[PDB]
Amino acid sequence: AVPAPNQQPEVFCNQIFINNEWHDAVSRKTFPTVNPSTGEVICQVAEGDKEDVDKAVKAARAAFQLGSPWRRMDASHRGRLLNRLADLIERDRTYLAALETLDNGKPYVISYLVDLDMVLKCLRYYAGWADKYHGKTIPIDGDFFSYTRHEPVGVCGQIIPWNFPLLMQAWKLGPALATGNVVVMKVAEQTPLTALYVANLIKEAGFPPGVVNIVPGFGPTAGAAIASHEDVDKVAFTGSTEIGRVIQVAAGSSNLKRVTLELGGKSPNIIMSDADMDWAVEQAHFALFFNQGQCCCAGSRTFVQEDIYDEFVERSVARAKSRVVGNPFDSKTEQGPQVDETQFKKILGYINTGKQEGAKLLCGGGIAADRGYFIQPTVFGDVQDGMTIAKEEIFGPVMQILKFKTIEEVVGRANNSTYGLAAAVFTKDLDKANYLSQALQAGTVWVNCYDVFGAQSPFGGYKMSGSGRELGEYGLQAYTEVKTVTVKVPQKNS
Amino acid sequence: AVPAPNQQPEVFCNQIFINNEWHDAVSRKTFPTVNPSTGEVICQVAEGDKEDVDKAVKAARAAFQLGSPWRRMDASHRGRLLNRLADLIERDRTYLAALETLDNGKPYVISYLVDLDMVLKCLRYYAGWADKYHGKTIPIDGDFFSYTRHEPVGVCGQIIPWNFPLLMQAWKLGPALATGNVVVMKVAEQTPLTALYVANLIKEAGFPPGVVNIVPGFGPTAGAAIASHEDVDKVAFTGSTEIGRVIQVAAGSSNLKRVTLELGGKSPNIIMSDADMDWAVEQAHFALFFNQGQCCCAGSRTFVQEDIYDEFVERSVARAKSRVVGNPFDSKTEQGPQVDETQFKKILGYINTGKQEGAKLLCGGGIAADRGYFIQPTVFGDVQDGMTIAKEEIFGPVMQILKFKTIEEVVGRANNSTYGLAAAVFTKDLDKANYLSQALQAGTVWVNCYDVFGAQSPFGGYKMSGSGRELGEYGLQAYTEVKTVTVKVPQKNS
Amino acid sequence: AVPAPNQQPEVFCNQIFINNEWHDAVSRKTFPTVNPSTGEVICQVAEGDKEDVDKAVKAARAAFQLGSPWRRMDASHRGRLLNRLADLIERDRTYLAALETLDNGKPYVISYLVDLDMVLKCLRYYAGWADKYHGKTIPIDGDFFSYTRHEPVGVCGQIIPWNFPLLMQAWKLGPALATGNVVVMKVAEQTPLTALYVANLIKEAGFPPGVVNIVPGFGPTAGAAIASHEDVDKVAFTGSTEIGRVIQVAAGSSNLKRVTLELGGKSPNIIMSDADMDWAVEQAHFALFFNQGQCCCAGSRTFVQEDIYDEFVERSVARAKSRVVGNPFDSKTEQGPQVDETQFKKILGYINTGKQEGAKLLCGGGIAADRGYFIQPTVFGDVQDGMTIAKEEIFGPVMQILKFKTIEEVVGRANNSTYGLAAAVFTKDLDKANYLSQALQAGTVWVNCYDVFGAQSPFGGYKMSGSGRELGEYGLQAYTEVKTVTVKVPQKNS
Amino acid sequence: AVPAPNQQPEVFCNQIFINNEWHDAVSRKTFPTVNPSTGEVICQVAEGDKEDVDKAVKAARAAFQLGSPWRRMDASHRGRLLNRLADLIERDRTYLAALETLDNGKPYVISYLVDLDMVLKCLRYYAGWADKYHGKTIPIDGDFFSYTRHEPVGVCGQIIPWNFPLLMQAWKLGPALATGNVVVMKVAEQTPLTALYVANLIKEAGFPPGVVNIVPGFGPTAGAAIASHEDVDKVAFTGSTEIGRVIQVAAGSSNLKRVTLELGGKSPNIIMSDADMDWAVEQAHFALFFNQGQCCCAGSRTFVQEDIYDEFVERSVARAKSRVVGNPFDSKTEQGPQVDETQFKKILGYINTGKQEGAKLLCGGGIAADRGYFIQPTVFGDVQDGMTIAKEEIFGPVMQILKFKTIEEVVGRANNSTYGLAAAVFTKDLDKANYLSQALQAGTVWVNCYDVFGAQSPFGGYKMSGSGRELGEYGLQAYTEVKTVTVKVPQKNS
Structure with missing residues (x-):
């Protein structure tokens, strides 16, 4: 309406x-x-x-x-x-x-x-x-x-x-x-x-x-x-x-x-092996690509357990490739242009650096239109903690997916950062949800949701x-x- | 110590x-x-x-x-x-x-x-x-x-x-x-x-x-x-x-x-099919038989889903039969005598009425010692909502186990009472726990625990x-x- | 406007x-x-x-x-x-x-x-x-x-x-x-x-x-x-x-x-000898005659120290005699009729009883108009604690003025009642105001004001x-x- | 005891x-x-x-x-x-x-x-x-x-x-x-x-x-x-x-x-003409000379109205001259030595500067003992706002008395500072107390008291x-x- x-x-x-x-x-x-x-x-x-x-x-x-x-x-x-x-x-x-x-x-x-x-x-x-x-x-x-x-x-x-x-x-x-x-x-x-x-x-x-x-x-x-x-x-x-x-x-x-x-911040996103696959994928995509990724609490780091890493990566790539980029006044448009040329060039440089560091480029990675500051939705897989993209705030539509094995390891890796603005947890277990909410050193923790601002x-x-x-x-x-x-x-x- | x-x-x-x-x-x-x-x-x-x-x-x-x-x-x-x-x-x-x-x-x-x-x-x-x-x-x-x-x-x-x-x-x-x-x-x-x-x-x-x-x-x-x-x-x-x-x-x-x-009150106890069996059985036994069942918030009504009704009943009977009754000053004693003769006779009459109404007597149901007000741990199975024991506060070591099929039905049956002092929920799912905690009309709701008084x-x-x-x-x-x-x-x- | x-x-x-x-x-x-x-x-x-x-x-x-x-x-x-x-x-x-x-x-x-x-x-x-x-x-x-x-x-x-x-x-x-x-x-x-x-x-x-x-x-x-x-x-x-x-x-x-x-209630009103005379008189008149005296917290009992009793009584009588009674829709009207005939007759009976008990009638005391439930503003002076009007809620435009000598005596007399809905204190001293606010057993205490409802x-x-x-x-x-x-x-x- | x-x-x-x-x-x-x-x-x-x-x-x-x-x-x-x-x-x-x-x-x-x-x-x-x-x-x-x-x-x-x-x-x-x-x-x-x-x-x-x-x-x-x-x-x-x-x-x-x-801070102290003279003098002396004047909220600036300036100054001088300085372990001792030599020399320099600026020296102003960091209680009268002692925190037993005429002027002068740690008001009027408490830009405001720390x-x-x-x-x-x-x-x- x-x-x-x-x-x-x-x-x-x-x-x-x-x-x-x-x-x-x-x-x-x-x-x-x-x-x-x-x-x-x-x-x-x-x-x-x-x-x-x-x-x-x-x-x-x-x-x-x-x-x-x-x-x-x-x-x-x-x-x-x-x-x-x-x-x-x-x-x-x-x-x-x-x-x-x-x-x-x-x-x-x-x-x-x-x-x-x-x-x-x-x-x-x-x-x-x-x-x-x-x-x-x-x-x-x-x-x-x-x-x-x-x-x-x-x-x-x-x-x-x-x-x-x-x-x-x-x-x-x-x-x-x-x-x-x-x-x-x-x-x-x-x-x-x-x-x-x-x-x-x-x-x-x-x-x-x-x-x-x-x-x-x-x-x-x-x-x-x-x-x-x-x-x-x-x-x-x-x-x-x-x-x-x-x-x-x-x-x-x-x-x-x-x-x-x-x-x-560099807010992480943790997906447990027992989480709802469709809801987790959709919420992660919304968390990272909201407002063209120009959000202070964007879920740049997406931690996915090794059990469901392949399916989650495939679904995330499929969802990202289907995102519509174009004129913001158009009804079908889902992603608009960047705020200015400086951010456009910075995001392009970040994508180039991520490609150079050895991170696997799954989709996107280039300019979306010949006029305006439009960038294709980019997803990076097999991201390591030592990579620059995994530590600096790209502040753009770039998705990084990281793999973890145990819950203690993922807690240690997520808390190993200088930013604690936000975090997210996707699971169906009560004990895992409570433990992750208490352990994470973040100002705001979301469970089975993201960007729920009131x-x-x-x-x-x-x-x-x-x-x-x-x-x-x-x-x-x-x-x-x-x-x-x-x-x-x-x-x-x- | x-x-x-x-x-x-x-x-x-x-x-x-x-x-x-x-x-x-x-x-x-x-x-x-x-x-x-x-x-x-x-x-x-x-x-x-x-x-x-x-x-x-x-x-x-x-x-x-x-x-x-x-x-x-x-x-x-x-x-x-x-x-x-x-x-x-x-x-x-x-x-x-x-x-x-x-x-x-x-x-x-x-x-x-x-x-x-x-x-x-x-x-x-x-x-x-x-x-x-x-x-x-x-x-x-x-x-x-x-x-x-x-x-x-x-x-x-x-x-x-x-x-x-x-x-x-x-x-x-x-x-x-x-x-x-x-x-x-x-x-x-x-x-x-x-x-x-x-x-x-x-x-x-x-x-x-x-x-x-x-x-x-x-x-x-x-x-x-x-x-x-x-x-x-x-x-x-x-x-x-x-x-x-x-x-x-x-x-x-x-x-x-x-x-x-x-x-x-007549506080109910709900056991979901996905709950931890051992912990649920032990906590239900503690909830009902604490202080010889002389607790205002005793979990008299134990709702168990049809999936795990048989195993839960067997474990509860086995645990109740092993409860030690004797002199309270003895270290091995787990259950003492009743407060007075009036409560003793009232509990005996309640047990007799429960037996008359057609509830299946699983264990106990009689006097535990020839001297003092000691009562054997009693467990009633296949209890119906129309039974007197399922509606009145026995205020004694009498256990009643009821069967439910769906969560909406168990919520309706548990809330269909004039008492709302307390309630309990045993499960491992986050959504079920939240929904049950919100729906139950009880003053205090415990999740995977009971009698946690602070x-x-x-x-x-x-x-x-x-x-x-x-x-x-x-x-x-x-x-x-x-x-x-x-x-x-x-x-x-x- | x-x-x-x-x-x-x-x-x-x-x-x-x-x-x-x-x-x-x-x-x-x-x-x-x-x-x-x-x-x-x-x-x-x-x-x-x-x-x-x-x-x-x-x-x-x-x-x-x-x-x-x-x-x-x-x-x-x-x-x-x-x-x-x-x-x-x-x-x-x-x-x-x-x-x-x-x-x-x-x-x-x-x-x-x-x-x-x-x-x-x-x-x-x-x-x-x-x-x-x-x-x-x-x-x-x-x-x-x-x-x-x-x-x-x-x-x-x-x-x-x-x-x-x-x-x-x-x-x-x-x-x-x-x-x-x-x-x-x-x-x-x-x-x-x-x-x-x-x-x-x-x-x-x-x-x-x-x-x-x-x-x-x-x-x-x-x-x-x-x-x-x-x-x-x-x-x-x-x-x-x-x-x-x-x-x-x-x-x-x-x-x-x-x-x-x-x-x-029977809320009292205490006027100290150091209070502002004009403001105290006006606020007492407003407190008692507000809404034709049909207020739950009306200051029926007006305690005035012996030092300023005569001047306060004279000013209160002069103010009450000048109050306008008539059609409520008229702009100049200050007091309307009573709610119903029952209250009219009850207030008339209360005035008659107060006159019989020996309280001095200063002004008013009768019907204000031949049509409608209008009552003249009535003021009673030299009221004693034993009088019926000093104990029962008249719920009408009747003013009772009582005399006190010391602050301890007035506190004892004001608190000697079964009602504690409200009270008031009029003074310019800080210590007297604090002591009276703390000592009075009233739900609401007003200092140099009345009917200040927020x-x-x-x-x-x-x-x-x-x-x-x-x-x-x-x-x-x-x-x-x-x-x-x-x-x-x-x-x-x- | x-x-x-x-x-x-x-x-x-x-x-x-x-x-x-x-x-x-x-x-x-x-x-x-x-x-x-x-x-x-x-x-x-x-x-x-x-x-x-x-x-x-x-x-x-x-x-x-x-x-x-x-x-x-x-x-x-x-x-x-x-x-x-x-x-x-x-x-x-x-x-x-x-x-x-x-x-x-x-x-x-x-x-x-x-x-x-x-x-x-x-x-x-x-x-x-x-x-x-x-x-x-x-x-x-x-x-x-x-x-x-x-x-x-x-x-x-x-x-x-x-x-x-x-x-x-x-x-x-x-x-x-x-x-x-x-x-x-x-x-x-x-x-x-x-x-x-x-x-x-x-x-x-x-x-x-x-x-x-x-x-x-x-x-x-x-x-x-x-x-x-x-x-x-x-x-x-x-x-x-x-x-x-x-x-x-x-x-x-x-x-x-x-x-x-x-x-x-440079907390002021305001004495109104209607305040209790003895209590005000004693509380001002305690406020300024407490802990040898080594208090963050010491009432260095003492504002006294022109009506009671002479009597207040005389009483303050008499009280200060009678203060006992000596060995802290002695029972009769009221003031001990300074914390160290640096503070001793700084306070001496402040006293010398205050004397040079033209402030009238009423009492004290020198060393109290030949051994240890003891300073005589010093009181400065006729202090002006432009004087250094009236602007800098002496942090010692030095008293400065300033004269004001109207309440608005004293509020403007007291609030005309870069420090708002504390303030005090001494009066018996309710309106003056409330207005001064609300107008003063201080973190803590005391009425008829000082250093009331809870x-x-x-x-x-x-x-x-x-x-x-x-x-x-x-x-x-x-x-x-x-x-x-x-x-x-x-x-x-x-």
Whole structure:
């Protein structure tokens, strides 16, 4: 029941969003955005700069002053504003899905049924938490009355990736606005249009000026300026590991602001010999090739027991060869183009390196179309732990299948990594499922499923995959600082 | 590593415990306690009366007055007192286990390794919750500061059964003293000695006078007096369904005091065809014959699929025939005598009725010894749902095995009862385990185990098995009334 | 900004609401509803009966069966349905306010700005809690994995009073539908129209058939049938103490169903000599004369220190004499008529008895209009604790002012009652405020304010004022039964 | 009731504690510890090095492996071990207090009645949280069963300051061992003996080898090695701001390990004109001169309204001049010597700079004794915001009194700082207290009290004073990583 899409929607939101008004860059420099399906320029977006970041941060700080309309606003009213924003987004669902498809390149059906549905669910979920994050009345010793108040941390600088523009923007705006903070958001240079349109919808919803500010920046300049600003109380970053380390170093060296990181990973996928063959094959294919493999928790490493290795490999190759690649607006299309040329060339180089290392190429391994950044679904068999493709995040539609013999060995091999963002287990035995769920050192473990993301369930990673959580009640912890008030009383009684 | 027991320990605590002092009954009437292993009288215990209950309630109310030492005491100090009581109980572990064996009749090894260990664990667990039951700072609308304070409900009247004297006494004293309440406890007429010795230990521990009061009463007179007293803010009862209904009616007609009930049940046990045969048989035998079958959550109904019915029945009969019955102080003894003559005759009548109804008698079915209340382990096969033994709680060492064909049918048959205290599932499939755990209408569901009781895990029952919970954090809810305080502030800010 | 009201709105919802359809009474008997402002009949409403209650309970049980659309519905979808119902109610806000004014008699401005605003706030608040009531993963000892699941209790029978039809209906429907229960509601015979229109809106919102059922019954027959039905898992009652005791006795004697009571009270009001005179006088007048004094937590007892007794009495008399009584639809009207003739005559008799007992009559004390149930604002001075008016709930616009000398004496006198529903303290000292808030034995304590009701803040009473809470997170506890699932694991690790 | 102290207790614990065994430094280098009361050397302590840190971290990682005794240990058993450690510490309370006095220089009465009492309270409090930190069973959408498990973060490197050796060591060990982590602790070079004796007591208590490891290091070498080690999952630091920034930078550049900081502050103290004069003066004196002013939350800035400035200044000077300085083991002694010569010279330089800036010297300002690091109590009046002493943390017995006129001005001046660790308000008005508690940007706010530290109440700071909390339930969050497990089920029901 997908409505008819407009393949070339109009683009007008291309400036910096500050104080519920659109301002051009101080340097007047603009950067172009490229449609990945065809390689042509969609529109020109103003390039964020350090001075623009300073203006946005000053506006946010002014909006966060004590006694301001945002600070005096009731929590239930903040939830009502979030619900109003969600309703406004749902009103323009078709246009937002079309713009997301045009800018990112993901299939329109996926954008309409998955991305925007999850955005609405996340916004409406964090609308509820506005007036339900209670404190505590501490029963301290002596004739004292102690209690804790949950207060907004302050100005929050948020940097979102390009794989899920709307979804990550919702995940960042939900808890921040629910807890009463002000946001100075930096969007990815690849996909800036959807965030700007959402900012216009935010202005329409009725948020006070300066609460939400979006600065579209082209490069690490705006991100570094946000992470190094003194008035930014907290910085939240989601992206590559190197940029995350740079942001953390800059934040620690600037004002010791709170830092929350959500980096990439090398999430494994374990298939036990007793698992349902068809369901396991389909779920592994979906886990690896979802969003053209541009997922932080993609199941790149697929561990299959020696008993069912041959049949699983054959079924996976057959399924991958039948995947449809083409124009995302087409109904039959299952895989769209890559986000940009850089990722296209990086994935091609990764495929070439994997072929050089001796991994068996089962299918794909080349360009899918002469125009656009389309890559054929690639599957690598007989992959070893020493191979580069088995250790680095390809971040593309490349499948690697590894063989294991015993459960202890597969646990040791899966946990032998610097990333613990996610993991999966496919089996029908209760004991094996429990043991694998407990032993695996992953932030999220899925049993007989994959990519089951809910706003209620927190998401995070161990080791160097990041720190903290971004979903559920745990997400509210990062955007809140606890204040303890102790009052002397004439006499305390139980 | 069980220490050498004293088969005839001295009994001196046989009076009413009020205000940390021992008082005789006002009417000077005493009731005898009978050793179940031999049928002889152990000692004479003063019989509780309505006037004695009034004296105990007056003492408790005096100890609960505002500004009293108990009310002004810090929560951490209450936890320290609970830990001190637990240490004192552990110091006299051997004597308490011997007295429990002498009075109840359960094996000494069980009393030392299971009952007292669980008592210590429960006391030390509820010691921790003394200063960790926080309130909430409600984020109400408007310029108001609202918060909730958890206060003791008041004088609590508690009636404990005879199957687990020490364990039920600990389960009742833990949350009540942890939340800062005063206790007026009524103990079972069958096993009153252990509770009185524990009361003496409570006096030694250092509790303020009047905090804990124990009135040993012979019959429903003391229980009715406690449940109908006006100064009793809350009544907690654990026992038969009829007495629970009477207590609830009296409490509702007296002063609308809060009532918490924990009645018996007819907990089923389901064995799937794919379950581990040896483990399932052993766990079913332990589930049904634990504590001579005198358990509220005994797995009386054993549902076995038609595929493994014959082998399971044969193994269960073989295991039951090998059970050792004899003197509880003997090391090799596995089953002791019944609590009293009334239960002995009731179980004999139930066995006779089951034989009359046409159920196949596999083993046992008669008296085990010429002296004492010993009953042979009885197993009934080919039991139908219409049989009386399949519907009423025998509360004895009688095993009933029922046959089922499909999982939907077994769910419908197991849930077709007025009791939902507990249930069990034995299987190796994940989907079957999850579906059975979700479908069964039981307060507690065990998978591949039984009688796994932890102080942390709450315990309760659905339907007419009772209301509320007695373990874990949920146990603290019943013994606490919430007070909300709202204060007008000059200006509220997030 | 109150829209123009329709003084005589059309009435069409006058039948029994079962399975999203309107059915006449089986006996075809109808009872009339009387407009309190004029004494004329508004419409004829079908009279509920035991057979109709049985039909509604059967429909609710059918809708609550495992696998039904309501049971399989996601929690977030239940919250969305609640939000949709709130939006539908807000769409017809003017008509609902006009009908509430026509049926109850409260001023239209109050109905539009207070009652319906609170109804919308409560519904939207309990919409949020749909998917945020998590369980617990208990860390039990041994190689076991234990967790708790919060499940709906089942069919809930709810009886609502007549003072706040829409507000109490929302307070009952919020948590019940949020936790996934089915409702069989019994409405007051005085004000049945608004609940039926809300039921029609519920049908329009999209709830599955049988989830919500409303049976308008004339008398205690329907209430007794609901409280004594075997398929009703939980009964919630809000009203007089005697009917609450009867309901509790019947429920305990029928199937031991869970009972939650919210009865009336004699809430005191304490004015300290250092309090702000104008604010204290205005808040006391609002506390006592709100909703024509037809509030369960009305500040009937007004304790004023001897220092400011004369000035407070003079100001209270002056304020009471200036209160406007007349047609509720008039803008200048501040007090409407009483709910029915019975309350009118009872309040007149209470005023006569208070005059006979020797209490000084300061103002009012008679009928306010020759047509309708209008009573002049009455104030009684020099009231003693032994007077009947100082002990019984008049439930009308009668003010009683009592004098106290010391804070300990006023605490002792205020707590010397069988009701603890609410209390208030007016002062500027921190120590006095804290001591009074801690010492008073009231379910809710207000400081320098009164009737500050928020959906987030729980509401309840001590002693015989009721049991349990109806607002906030505490409200969800009553409509939920906890199931514990313990699974044996091969090996447990921290 | 302070027992007789041994002024020169024996010192034997002077090595590195690894695997429950004492090992000398690999380089065999030892650093001396100096008694502050006399300036003589107490004993020689082995100097920690990077290689020793590597050995300790390897031992901790070995003890943290899956299936190890520490990992398989029950949570209740961890709480029991913590309680056993607390009991062992209480057994040697006198010796520990004497050693603390000998090494730190604080008065023996303070060490016995305050420091060790708080250590015991903290240990026994965190013993309770061992088996009470539940997870959540997330109600996710779809046919899925999702839940969260709280797991230990891993090897934790902890660096403790010298002002409160035992208290900070307990604050670090409590949550870390309660949540099931392994500790590699670095102690201050000034006071290493007490931590080593506590480590010996830990070995005696029965902790498995490698769970707790203490490396006494002389300088930033050991701290940098701990913060830069790859196997250290989390680092917790408490000390100066510069070292905290260095540690955060190193941790971010090494492996992105979680960092928790608790730095110093410039906590203000506000005295309103209506506050109790005697209580305010005494509490301000205690707040500033507690522990010789070597407190992170010392009330250095004392804001006094112009109405009571003169009387408050006179009373503060009179109280400060009467403070007793001398040998800490003497009963009449109220203030001991400084921790070391460096702090002595820094405080002298700060006093000289304050005198140069034009601040009025009221009393003190020089050396108190010819032997030892004793400083006279110094009070500075007419202090301005531009003065250096009013902005930098003197960390000594220097009092600064500032004058303010209005409440808005004092709020603006108090919040105009880079530190928000703590604040205090002294008044009798309710509105002023609430407004000041809400407006002040401090981690902890005290009303009519100061330094009211309870294990239950969390402690932290805003701005650059640190991040996170170290006490209460909030303390457990830092030492725990959340794992989410989602399992597909055949059919989900509410």
